[PDB]
């Protein structure tokens, strides 16, 4: 069995990565310019984009890639590091509102995870939690078009 989403970690931070189009993407604010561990040694990022908070390495072993969305649906579904799914309604190119706000912790450690459309296709990578008094009501993300362009 292969996973499209991998739970990654650094010496100080744990978050997620998502394989899309053969690349293992994640958020620069978590990975930095780090190499990804491999049973043959460190593997370097294929892409590093500080501006977009995006970095990607070749997809690791035990993974399978996700297909980008092509239906332009605005009904998104965020998957957390605990496998929970959170319905998010898109509000724009890179922002969505949780249908049911949740404690910030509920979303902690999940940046880098996928924002899926009704078909399970990648809409974007969860970038950051937009919260008020500790309650995450919205989500910030990196649309797949960015990943796609970055791969060029």
């Amino acid at each position: 069995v292969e996973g499209e989403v991998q739970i990654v970690s650094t010496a100080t931070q744990t978050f997620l990565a998502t394989c899309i189009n053969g690349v293992c993407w994640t958020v620069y604010h978590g990975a930095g310019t780090r190499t990804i561990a491999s049973p043959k040694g460190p593997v370097i990022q294929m892409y590093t984009n500080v501006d977009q908070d995006l970095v990607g390495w070749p997809a690791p072993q035990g993974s399978r890639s996700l297909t980008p969305c092509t239906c332009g649906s605005s009904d998104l579904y965020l998957v957390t590091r605990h496998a929970d799914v959170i319905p998010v309604r898109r509000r724009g190119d890179s922002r969505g509102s949780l249908l049911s706000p949740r404690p910030i912790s509920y979303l902690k450690g999940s940046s880098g995870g996928p924002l899926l459309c009704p078909t399970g296709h990648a809409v974007g990578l969860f970038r950051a939690a937009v919260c008020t008094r500790g309650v995450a009501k919205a989500v910030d993300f990196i649309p797949v078009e960015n990943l796609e362009t970055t791969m060029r």
Partner: peptide
């Protein structure tokens, strides 16, 4: 340092 994979998630819920 380096980023290490400590786990994985299968979207379809596929069991081994």
């Amino acid at each position: 340092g380096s980023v290490v994979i400590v786990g994985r998630i299968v979207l379809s819920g596929k069991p081994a």
